[PDB]
Amino acid sequence: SYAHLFSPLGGDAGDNYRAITFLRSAHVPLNAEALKACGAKYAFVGVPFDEGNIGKPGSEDAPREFRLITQEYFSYWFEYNVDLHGKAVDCGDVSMPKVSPEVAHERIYRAVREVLKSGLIPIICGGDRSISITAARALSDHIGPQKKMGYMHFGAQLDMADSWAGERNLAPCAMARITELPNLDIRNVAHLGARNAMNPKDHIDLSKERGLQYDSMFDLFDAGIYPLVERSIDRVWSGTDAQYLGFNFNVMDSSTAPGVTSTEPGGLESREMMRIVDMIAKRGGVSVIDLTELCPIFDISGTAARLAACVIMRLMASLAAQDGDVIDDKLRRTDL
Amino acid sequence: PGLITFLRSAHVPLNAEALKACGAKYAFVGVPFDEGNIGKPGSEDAPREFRLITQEYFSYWFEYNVDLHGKAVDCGDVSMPKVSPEVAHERIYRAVREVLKSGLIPIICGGDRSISITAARALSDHIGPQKKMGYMHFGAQLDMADSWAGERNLAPCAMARITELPNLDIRNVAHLGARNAMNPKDHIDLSKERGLQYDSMFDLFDAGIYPLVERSIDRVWSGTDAQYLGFNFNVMDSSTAPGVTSTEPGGLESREMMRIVDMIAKRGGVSVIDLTELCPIFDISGTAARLAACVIMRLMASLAAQDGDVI
Amino acid sequence: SYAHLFSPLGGDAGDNYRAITFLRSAHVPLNAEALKACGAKYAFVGVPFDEGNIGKPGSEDAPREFRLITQEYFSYWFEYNVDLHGKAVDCGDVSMPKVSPEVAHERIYRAVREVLKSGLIPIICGGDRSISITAARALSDHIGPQKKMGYMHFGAQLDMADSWAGERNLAPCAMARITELPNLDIRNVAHLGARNAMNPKDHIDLSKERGLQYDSMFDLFDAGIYPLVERSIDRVWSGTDAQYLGFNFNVMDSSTAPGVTSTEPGGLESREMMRIVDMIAKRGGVSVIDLTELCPIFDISGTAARLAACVIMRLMASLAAQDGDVIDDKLRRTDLV
Amino acid sequence: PGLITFLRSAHVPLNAEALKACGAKYAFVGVPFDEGNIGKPGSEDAPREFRLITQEYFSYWFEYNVDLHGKAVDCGDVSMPKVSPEVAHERIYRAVREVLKSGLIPIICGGDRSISITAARALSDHIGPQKKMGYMHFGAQLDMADSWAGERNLAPCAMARITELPNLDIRNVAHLGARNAMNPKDHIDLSKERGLQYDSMFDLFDAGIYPLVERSIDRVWSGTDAQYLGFNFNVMDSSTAPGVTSTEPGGLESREMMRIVDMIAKRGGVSVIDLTELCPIFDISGTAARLAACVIMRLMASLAA
Amino acid sequence: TAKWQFTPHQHRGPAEQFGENDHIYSPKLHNGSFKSRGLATFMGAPYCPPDRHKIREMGAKICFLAVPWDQGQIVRAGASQGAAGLRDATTQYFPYMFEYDVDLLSFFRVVDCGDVPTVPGNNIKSQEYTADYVTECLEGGAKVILFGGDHSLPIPGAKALSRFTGSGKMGYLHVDCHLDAGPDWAGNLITNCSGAPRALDLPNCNARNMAHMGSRNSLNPKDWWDFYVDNEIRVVTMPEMIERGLEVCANEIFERVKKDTDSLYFTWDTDSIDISCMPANSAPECYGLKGREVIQLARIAGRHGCDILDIVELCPYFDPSQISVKMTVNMIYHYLGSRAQTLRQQGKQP
Amino acid sequence: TAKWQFTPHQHRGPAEQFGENDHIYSPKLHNGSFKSRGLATFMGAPYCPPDRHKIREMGAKICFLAVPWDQGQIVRAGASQGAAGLRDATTQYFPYMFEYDVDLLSFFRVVDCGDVPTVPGNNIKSQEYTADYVTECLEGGAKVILFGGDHSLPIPGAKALSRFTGSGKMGYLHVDCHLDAGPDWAGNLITNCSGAPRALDLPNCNARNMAHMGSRNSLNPKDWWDFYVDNEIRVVTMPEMIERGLEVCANEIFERVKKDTDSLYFTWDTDSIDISCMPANSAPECYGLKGREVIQLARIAGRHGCDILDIVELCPYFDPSQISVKMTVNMIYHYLGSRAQTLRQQGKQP
Ligand SMILES: [Mn+2]
Ligand SMILES: [Mn+2]
Ligand SMILES: [Mn+2]
Ligand SMILES: [Mn+2]
């Protein structure tokens, strides 16, 4: 069936595209056999967990809001001649009712391992940044000690606290734990967007001690943004067997993503990020995609959530185009 | 995990066989349709916000020793095209008929008050011309326009259409709460001409509320084979129902409606429940949506207690 | 001076009552010596802690909003002929930057014991309901094994979870911990306002098993509200040496208190609560006053916070009137200068 | 601990001796006065909201390797009566003189743009008739009403009063960002009659912004003994300054104002900083207040570097 | 000569309606302004400039005049936005009240006189403007509905009514959470906390025809209470209204403020209303009138009648709902519907 | 005979201003409507009913006509509230633009024609009304600014301009995040996603004079793209605008849609604007025009000129700020200021 490509027909075919799963995809249980059998390339996994956050509360509601906002779009991308229909499934949310944070993280880890076992690309929607520690560890364990991982994250905060209030796996520690993964060489790590007054000196110091070559927002401005992004893309993708890509949309200028846990004006514009998406998609693959720290209670007109969905879906569409996975442009609505 | 449903209930397709097999007594049906609305926009978002608000409540009603778990399922939203009202209404009609066919009670959440026209017609057709229907609606507006802007099935026409149903005797029709100036003279004239014995808010206050409510409950339930119960929460005082399409000062307070719900539940059954005109863009911290949820859930619990369906 | 009783004079005297401390009170450090010397009867203690909350977030910012809202009023109560000026001081907030929940509670405990040692009445503004566990433990320890405590709480939730996610001191556990205090007889415990669909069955079961004589919202309506409130006041105050009084303003109908962590319409009206405040003040004293679960991000026009401030300040004014602590009503603004 | 202060800074009484001894370079002064406002209400709440937003930021600025801890103190709000504008302005005047006496830089947060009239006069009086003042303001409105509704000290008169100060040569005055129709013809006429060389937004875009900003910086700082710098954040594009009294589309973006801050800081000093017309009731998730806070704090960090 | 004329359901052009009573019936050719306000006046009434000659030529017997001034305020600005919310909110109603069987628009020949202009920062001059605009309405033969704006409104409002009343006697009723009887505020005699003492100072307004209803809480400095004690002016606190009932108290006070009077000024602060019904206010207050009691008080006021009704301190920016603006519509409409029903029962003309 | 007359700074009564140029200067006796809107029309212009004879008698050369209809919408209602927000926001500006040295009100003799009435539930009849109201404006001798309302507006709008253009040729420019070229939507040919095919269907609107600018993202079913391919209508996507430059692209496109034409219909969806500057929209979209680019495009449009400008889908209830409504004021005002500057430069008359 191709009816989903086009304006709905009348009669019993009339319906309302916005009246819930990610991009209206089929629901598939978090089971590797089922995921392998459904034909999709991506599995959306909601992680409504915020116990790692030390800042403004609210990310727990982001997966539901993100799902809802994807109903506002069609699966077809005229800019790319690609159709995302059937390319993703929605695995629901990791179940974490009335459990300890250690148990919550165990469930996240098992969920991520299970999707990776299926061969599908997990799209992990938090939830707080701490989820990335667990999901990246799952990727690291999935590929094993003889393979190499690359990691790239966009965000205003480095999250390079060695410890926070006696704890070692809260959100502000996330990169400090991720860069300890044994098959993630620091030369294959990129972090883009760090801002003034969002990064304690100890975070800078630990980054320097470890050789983390983060690209601050000023670094990006000094370089004209794209040439430096391209160099960091090359470091993450060249020579690595798997790549983890994460987003905290506080990388964006505040007016372009108000509904996030923490923000400071002076970040990326949406037109800059959409160019970066194509540059990433040129490399022809990704192993895990995450998004964390959306904060719907602070959003207005769903701005940040719409931006997030448009970036994630554009990335999927641009990857399909780079793969030559395009639809027959001769298809017409009068065929139906 | 990850689906948002009424009271965290199971999703069941809008299919009579599935609904009869699932074991619930109520089927929640979302109707995000607002093209009958003549006032401020926003009720299309009500089914989602209502569902969300119900997620915050436990299903156990300790005062009734009742657990609402398993008593309802959620059929999702009626699928309807935009800018095609006649087709949208046909879709609503078919959905309500299918739930009624299962024997479950539809809980219909609009959307604008026009949907009641169709849902009431579905109940009327379901029971057939040899049976009698009763109808009770709470709201601040009579909605007795024979026509409005030359049109005949908009929200302000709803009662003018519903009271034309051939097996709904006007003596079995109640309308409670009318007040304030969104009630033009022809709505009163048509009510008098047809004998609609509405209980205005002033009349209710003058009577101490409950004795007059009881009299109108008796007219709707006594001698009828099926009863349709509908709410526009602007029947409530604005203070406790701000987020409605047309809020109205000087109405029922939350504890009063809760007492009325128990009076209705004494009758031991209802055939259709609707709620329309919730309007989340105007709400104050979800107060109107919470009031609606508490009224619906309390009616379910009180009906369960009346039936002896306790823990 | 008496100038604070009256509209401001002109010249150098002209100022703006609205332009932050509780009731524009002096700040006094959390130090028993200073508190005993400052002459006040109450010490306001903000507790911006929400790590015990499993529900909607927001209570951490309540103390600041509560202080802000009190700037909206004078210290004089014409209904009572009482002046609250100098009767309270503001001790600031308990400091809890980047610490474990256990350290936070330790700091809360230390703060409350320190105020109690000075002889002042703490007015503790949370923050989540869990802080009540610690504050009640402090009162229990302060009075000692030879004295008896009474406890009265208004709220829609019983908070009688024996444990929650394996934890024992989160907000939904608060009454389960408070009723284990060794000098708090269950017969001197009142809980008013419990609501359907906010109270799981095990919380009811545990209440029944322990003999917690809670007054549900239905019980209150069935009684005409006040006679039952009076019976519960009598149990809390008769025979006890110290009384703890706490509020979760979700006891109020949602229209009167929208900015709270969890609410369901069908609670008390403000005019009922103002009557209740005078009934409590008839007993002539209270040892601790707390308020928790205010949620400013959900408040509209500051409604819940204003209600809370009016209830608390009315209670202080009504207690003063009951003690005969009234001003000279012959004073006039023309006396000034 | 419970007292909300600009940048979590110490509170210091508005007293020259105390301010000189506390070790800070800046003194935050809240001015919740809005009785000169001719537009939508709301700026009276800005000093409180501004303080609150600054609580969210760390004091360390890694690109500058500067920590702002101890650089500022908070003097609280100026005490002013309502419905007595003349007395309120006298109170502002005395507060600004007292801070200037201490040698610290006042950071004055309104409140409405009328406050600038008085604060600028205080600076003018503080340096006295043998010294020269320079004045730079960013905003979408010229505020060049000789009178407005017959009154002479309302917000739209502010530049008409400030450019009458006797030791403020018009060649040492800059006004950047003017655009859109909240600029009636007499404001242009008076600017032309007086020689006010304002840099309109269209002028700025035509020049690539920064070269023109640099010329105006040079006019304000070169040869002057003291410099007053003021912001109405409606100079910014509406997208990044929604919560202001009179928001204006088509203005500076956040990264552009941040660059300009660095250009100003290159001159190594400023005598008074003001920010007026923040309007929290119109803000979107605090965006305008955050922009304002980031501009002020980046200015402090860049000056320290 | 000015003509009193309006379009039923507002819109002109090709789909204009012309029926002389079409405004009391469901709209026929279109939706009127129930969804989109268009260029609505208060009640859809004809606009008439505040000019005694134009008002008298139109035969108008009620003038709606907004006084949005909010810079005579000791609390916080915002009431300048009240009148726009009110006018918008009348599009949600018909001018016909079935509870009274009255067409308010044609019964009173209502006109919307627009807004009184303001001089920002200048409370003295802005109040001089208000008194002069109110005088045009009274001299035009109409009773007046004045919509604030802050509570400084009764100072020019009562002064204009007092001048118009001349050698007769004028009563003054003040309904408010706040006693509003500062002798001065920071030296200023004419802020929004001095309505009552400034009314007493008028040559024909006497303490025996003044009263205050609705007070509670601590935004009430001692001199505001002492004013009532020393002048022996009746004060009905909100707790007294609750204990005795609005009907008893309201009827008693109206009898008192109208006894042997030729005119009555009635000023009504929205803060009298419980904050649960009225969040959009400069200084909103719990422990007030519930919504049904507001409508009852408006009905009681309508039975007795006043010459000027003012309603003050509405701040719509503070309310994300429509409850506050629609409450103020009903204060006015129930007052007018009750007044018309009373006149008609008495065989009297407006 | 109708007279074109207005009061500078709006207020009549004792403090009315009368200077013939007072509306372009700081107000003199009072604050006008900068704080409190009063009874403001668009730009404070005279109201003129949409009637060709009245419009011509006033000499009006621009009619502002709101079309709040938002029930021809396939996304979500809300744009029925746009025109009220827009009119209110014009009180925050003078009608004088110093950037062009033009008094927009006097230059064009602007009038506010009120709103087109609607028939709820009946998209066919509501569009019939809109076309008839627009025809009165065109036949009265004015060019038109049409303010929605949903994006079904260009269907009756272009139909009325096409009718007026007769045997001549009409161009059609559509600026939007969304391609809006559904042949039908659920069988319906005239919803807000079909402006472009309904225009191409007009007998005197030809593909060579049609264009679409601003598109991006995936609310864009394939048939909407296929329409431009199958009819050889030029599409300039937002990424092309960014890459090549707004000025280069917009000038090429205005040259295209005006070439050998007698009139031009220009429809402009607020969603073309980046969501950071325009949250108040039925279908807001990232990756759009930034604020300075909106003004630049309005200026470019004004230099070339259109006969009808419509602006659609503004939903002010979704925005707690004034940014969206004030953006739509500036779209109109910069269009008119640039248009007047160009006419004056060419020695031509509106
Ligand atoms: Mn007052
Ligand atoms: Mn008051
Ligand atoms: Mn469109
Ligand atoms: Mn669009």
Author numbering:
A (entry chain E): 6 to 24, 28 to 344
B (entry chain D): 25 to 335
C (entry chain C): 6 to 24, 28 to 345
D (entry chain F): 25 to 329
E (entry chain B), F (entry chain A): 8 to 357
Paper text:
The asymmetric unit (AU) of the P212121 crystal showed an uneven stoichiometry of the two subunits, which contained two MetCa (α subunit) and four MetCb (β subunit) molecules. MetCa and MetCb share 34% identity in their amino acid sequences, whereas their overall architectures were found to be basically identical (rms deviation of 1.94 Å for 321 Cα atoms), and exhibited the canonical three-layer alpha-beta-alpha fold of the arginase protein superfamily. MetCa had an additional N-terminal loop (T8–G26, average B-factor of 25.7) contributing to the interaction with another MetCa subunit through a hydrophobic interface. Although the corresponding regions in both MetCa and MetCb were folded in a similar conformation, only the active site of MetCa contained a bimetallic center coordinated by four Asp (D183, D187, D276 and D278) and two His (H158 and H185) residues. In contrast, no electron density for metal ion was observed in the corresponding region of the subunit MetCb. This was likely due to the mutations in five of the six conserved metal ion coordinating residues in MetCb.
Either subunit alone is catalytically inactive, but together they work as an active enzyme highly specific for metformin. We also revealed the divergent functional evolution of the proteins from the ancient arginase family, in which MetCa retained a metal-containing catalytic subunit but MetCb evolved to be a pseudoenzyme as metal-free binding partner. Biochemical and structural studies demonstrated that the metformin hydrolase was a nickel metalloenzyme derived from the ancient arginase family.
